Design a protein around this ligand. Structure first.
Ligand SMILES: [Mg+2]
Ligand SMILES: [Mg+2]
Ligand SMILES: [Mg+2]
Ligand SMILES: [Mg+2]
Ligand SMILES: [Mg+2]
Ligand SMILES: [Mg+2]
Ligand SMILES: [Mg+2]
Ligand SMILES: [Mg+2]
Ligand SMILES: [Mg+2]
Lengths: 112, 185, 60, 124, 144, 79, 97
RNA sequence: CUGGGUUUGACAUGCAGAGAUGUCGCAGGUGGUGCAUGGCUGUCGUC
RNA sequence: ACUCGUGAGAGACUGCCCUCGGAGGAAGGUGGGGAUGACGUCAAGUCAUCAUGCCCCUUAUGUCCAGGGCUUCACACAUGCUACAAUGGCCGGUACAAAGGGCUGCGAUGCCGUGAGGUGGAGCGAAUCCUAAAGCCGGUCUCAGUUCGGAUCGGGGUCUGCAACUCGACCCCGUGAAGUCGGAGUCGCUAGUAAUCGCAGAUCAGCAACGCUGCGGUGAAUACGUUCCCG
């Protein structure tokens, strides 16, 4: 019930339970629970404690669960910002990065 | 907007294409070829393209204006096909639509006054069921433009069965250009 | 659209992309119909005057 | 034999009658399986049930064009014509019931300046 | 409508009841009849099974407890005698709208429970007819 | 994203092949914006055109995957 | 041993002149052919704005290519000589097959 | 707009270089004036 | 034979009892929609489609070329998609369109790949060849900013193109931002119409396309009335 990363979803199906982990969404959770493995309609309460640790060992090594992953996205931005690429000139003034028009409605980046 | 072209409006019923040739793969080229001819080269001009052959038929009031056989050779370079040229006459150049406009085009270009020059065309051509004629814009070197018309008999534009012969020409004065228009039913 | 930029379109483009298709009579860049190879405006001068065989108004 | 048209909304049907027990088939399929729908069930059988022949006749039918409500409504007019070719006793019943009318309902043309047929855009 | 009355739509009746096909269209949104009808057949045949134990008259007796005889209008408030057929339009259309407002999970259940409250006269649909009659009959002065 | 292969424009890379003899020296004028930075380049200057003037651009191993045009911003907003 | 004369042209009345002209030439050698058979008409459509800044106005411009299929059943050396030679359609495509 | 070239002007009467271009094998002008104009549309109004 | 494609035709005019209703007829009394814009208004738009009077540039305001730029951004208005959830989302089954487009083209079976694709070229200048979704029966989630929402961002890729940094969109994986039917005020629509759901085309190597112009699927509500505003 540890979830490896830390947090435990408050029950429900297992297919979606793994999406609350930062490394994993829907397709990689389908890949885990197929192989590891245990059915989609199984719930998080009705797993035994050793059945949770079979999920731990398989995905712990393979992907970034949270902090390792969390730092890598920021650390790639930190170099790219000062990397001098135009792509991270746009990071330093809080504007959109991927070649959008900033005349009307860039409010995801800029904010209210 | 006001008044669609009555030549184009009755294409299905009674007008018949000036160009009467068919193609598919060569269709872009034959339009580009005809644009060169009608700029280069008068009542009316028809064409009946066939592979390696063109009619290039002409209607003119004065047919005589030897020189045509040189103009064949001028067209021969642009087309690159066997030009079988015909120049034709037309009965009543008085009654023909573009030749009335070309008649008034000579008058206004030579500084004949427009109310004098118009009245000739409507009176003579009626001497057809009805005629409307209209000269438009910059008349006798006035500062502001105007358009006035004359008419005699009846000219129903909305009737599809009625064959209206339409014509246009831009007669070019010292001050600008006057656009003449001639409807003959 | 000028005289000089018309003869650009006639010339060999150097790269196969740059052939951009002016109108034949109109000499206008925008809205030149393929097949017709004519300016959109020019199409209405020709089609009303009975010049393009097989082309006529309209609806429906 | 009796062979009969029916149309609706550009949905071109065929029908043919043979006397027999109460069923009918649609390109090698049952009525219930082609139309799983209670509204379309009664609407096909309306000229049969109003006149009260019902179990007299087979129908074999071909279905082209349109959709489920189009082809279901098209069978009604196909049958309504076809039951007259049995005997024209049924015609004065079927006319007053109101099945011999095809719909001059058809989809209007989308016009320039307008997004659907009649609907203009926003203003001022 | 200025020049004269346009003709009213003809309306086909499994149950064979005018009111149910009228209810189907008031339920209907997005122009799809089948999902409109299966919610009606969900709610109607739920009220058949559990409580009322006949299908049509549970709705029809409940529909009397929605129907207003009188309505308010502003000349610029004059109360007006409502037509026999216009009373039925307000009867269905209110009954559907408060089913959309209700908190219960699905419209099979929401539209079912609304018809049961209209049979009693404790519902939000039956609440409105009193408010229209209250606003109508408190005036009367303005009617001339 | 040039699927298979990187792109450098051929007139650019010839000037870099001259620097091999010198092992790279000075800053070379560059009017092709469009070329990638192939790791032959690393530790070299060039003066890259802004559509106005030439901006000096030193190269490092961080700038390999990025294109040569990314380090000269063409329009200016201070306000 | 079957020849197919495919026609394409704009004017539907002008093909009815030619479709008769195919019959008279082949029915000299006598009988045979299907006759003409209608075949569906194509329609290219082109919407154009009526010089600048007025989008809502519009025209439409059809072009219709009417087509006939014919199908000659019997090839004969007397037929094929007369078929091409004396037959001349004016401003109408003919493709033998 | 910053440049690099050209001059009766592109139109009629392989090695170098960013590349055009080198060096060997009267025309023209999206240029001012739609309150100089023609032509072609919008609109009041399918009234 | 029945369709269906065209090609000829007939059939609706209150013609039989102002208008209420009759009998057939597939149809009613402007059957449905388009095409059509009188005499004129606004010195209405365009010298930038093309023409053109007058004036100006003639050693450049003409004329090639690479480079940028037309895609900026505190903001403001307008037009439109996607949404805010169970008349749902995901996912397995099973099925009904008619208009179209195709020679530097459209591209099938087949094997490779998670997929955009790669491979290879059958057939084809065409009623032959290539090109529905919503629905219905089941399953699963339980009124949560969620299995709603798909923006933004980080890694990687594919494809045309000499070249996708300025600025192409495509789909795999991580991230899951605002948003809980919207203030004053405002438009669209009288029946196969509103509302929703797809498909094709023109321009086009490629595509900023949710735009534009056409086609068909499902398919309502209400028109008591003329005082009330608008013309
Ligand atoms: Mg529609
Ligand atoms: Mg000028
Ligand atoms: Mg003006
Ligand atoms: Mg009229
Ligand atoms: Mg003005
Ligand atoms: Mg722009
Ligand atoms: Mg600013
Ligand atoms: Mg499915
Ligand atoms: Mg495209």
């Amino acid at each position: 019930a540890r979830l490896v990363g830390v947090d435990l979803p408050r029950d429900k199906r297992m297919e979606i339970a793994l999406t609350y982990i930062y490394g994993i969404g829907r397709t990689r959770s389908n890949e885990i629970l197929a192989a590891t493995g245990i059915d989609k309609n199984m719930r998080t309460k009705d797993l035994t404690d050793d059945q949770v640790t079979v999920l731990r060992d398989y995905i712990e090594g393979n992907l970034k669960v949270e902090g390792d992953l969390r730092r890598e996205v920021q650390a790639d931005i930190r170099r790219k910002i000062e990397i001098g690429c135009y792509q991270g000139l746009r990071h330093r003034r809080g504007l959109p990065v991927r070649g959008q028009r900033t005349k009307t409605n860039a409010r995801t980046r800029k904010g209210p | 907007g006001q008044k669609i072209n009555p030549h184009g409006f009755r294409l299905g019923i009674t007008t018949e294409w000036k160009s009467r040739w068919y193609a598919d793969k060569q269709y872009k080229d034959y339009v580009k070829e005809d644009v060169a001819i009608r700029k280069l080269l008068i009542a009316d001009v028809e064409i009946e393209r066939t592979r390696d052959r063109v009619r290039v038929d002409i209607h003119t009031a004065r047919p005589g204006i030897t020189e045509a056989d040189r103009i064949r050779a001028d067209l021969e370079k642009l087309t690159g096909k066997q030009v079988q040229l015909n120049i034709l006459e037309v009965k009543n150049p008085e009654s023909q639509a573009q030749l009335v406009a070309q008649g008034v085009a000579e008058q206004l270009s030579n500084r004949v006054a427009f109310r004098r020059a118009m009245r000739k065309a409507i009176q003579s051509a009626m001497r057809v069921k009805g005629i409307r004629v209209q000269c438009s814009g910059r008349l006798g070197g006035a500062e502001m433009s105007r358009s006035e018309f004359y008419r005699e008999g009846r000219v129903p534009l909305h009737t599809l069965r009625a064959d209206i012969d339409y014509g246009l020409y831009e007669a070019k004065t010292t001050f600008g250009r006057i656009g003449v228009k001639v409807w003959i039913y | 659209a000028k005289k000089a930029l018309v003869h650009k379109a006639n010339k060999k483009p150097k790269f196969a992309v740059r052939a951009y298709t002016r109108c034949n009579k109109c000499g206008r860049p925008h809205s030149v119909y393929r097949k017709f190879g004519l300016c959109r405006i020019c199409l209405r001068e020709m089609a009303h005057a009975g010049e393009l065989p097989g082309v006529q108004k309209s609806s429906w | 034999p009796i062979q009969t048209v029916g149309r609706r909304k550009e949905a071109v049907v065929r029908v043919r009658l043979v006397p027999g027990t109460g069923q009918f088939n649609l390109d090698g399929r049952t009525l219930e399986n082609y139309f799983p729908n209670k509204v379309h069930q009664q609407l096909i059988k309306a000229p049969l049930v109003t006149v009260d022949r019902v179990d007299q006749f087979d129908i074999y039918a071909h279905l082209d064009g349109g959709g489920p409500s189009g082809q279901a409504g098209a069978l009604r007019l196909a049958i309504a014509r076809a039951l007259i070719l049995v005997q024209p006793e049924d015609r004065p019943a079927l006319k007053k019931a109101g099945f011999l009318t095809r719909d001059p309902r058809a989809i209007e043309r989308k016009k320039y300046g307008l997004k659907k047929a009649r609907k203009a855009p926003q203003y001022s | 409508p200025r020049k004269g009355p346009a003709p009213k739509r003809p309306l086909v009746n499994v149950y064979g009841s005018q009111l149910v096909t009228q209810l189907v269209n008031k339920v209907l949104l997005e122009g799809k009849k089948s999902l409109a009808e299966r919610i009606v057949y969900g709610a109607l045949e739920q009220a058949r099974e559990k409580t009322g134990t006949d299908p049509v008259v549970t709705l029809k007796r409940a529909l009397d407890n929605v129907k207003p005889a009188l309505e308010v209008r502003s000349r610029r408030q004059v109360p007006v005698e409502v037509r026999p057929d216009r009373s039925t339009t307000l009867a269905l259309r209110w009954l559907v709208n408060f089913s959309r407002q209700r908190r219960e999970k699905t419209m099979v259940e929401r539209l079912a429970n609304e018809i049961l409250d209209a049979s009693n006269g404790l519902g939000a649909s039956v609440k409105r007819r009193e408010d229209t009659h209250k606003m109508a009959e408190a005036n009367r002065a303005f009617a001339h | 994203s040039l699927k298979k292969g990187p792109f450098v424009d051929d007139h650019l890379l010839k000037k870099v092949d001259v620097q091999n003899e010198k092992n790279t020296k000075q800053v070379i004028k560059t009017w092709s914006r469009r070329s990638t930075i192939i790791p032959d380049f690393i530790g070299h200057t060039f003066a890259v055109h802004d559509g106005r003037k030439h901006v000096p651009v030193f190269v490092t191993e961080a700038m390999v995957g990025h294109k040569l045009g990314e380090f000269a911003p063409t329009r200016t907003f201070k306000g | 041993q079957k020849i197919r004369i495919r026609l394409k042209a704009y004017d539907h009345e002008a093909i009815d002149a030619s479709a008769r002209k195919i019959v008279e030439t082949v029915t000299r050698t006598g009988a045979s052919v299907v006759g003409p058979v209608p075949l569906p008409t194509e329609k290219n459509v082109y919407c154009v704005i009526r010089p600048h800044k007025y989008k809502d106005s519009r025209e439409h411009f059809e072009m219709r290519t009417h087509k006939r299929l014919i199908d000659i059943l019997d090839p004969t050396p007397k037929t094929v000589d007369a078929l091409m030679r004396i037959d001349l359609p004016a401003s109408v495509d003919v493709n033998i097959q």
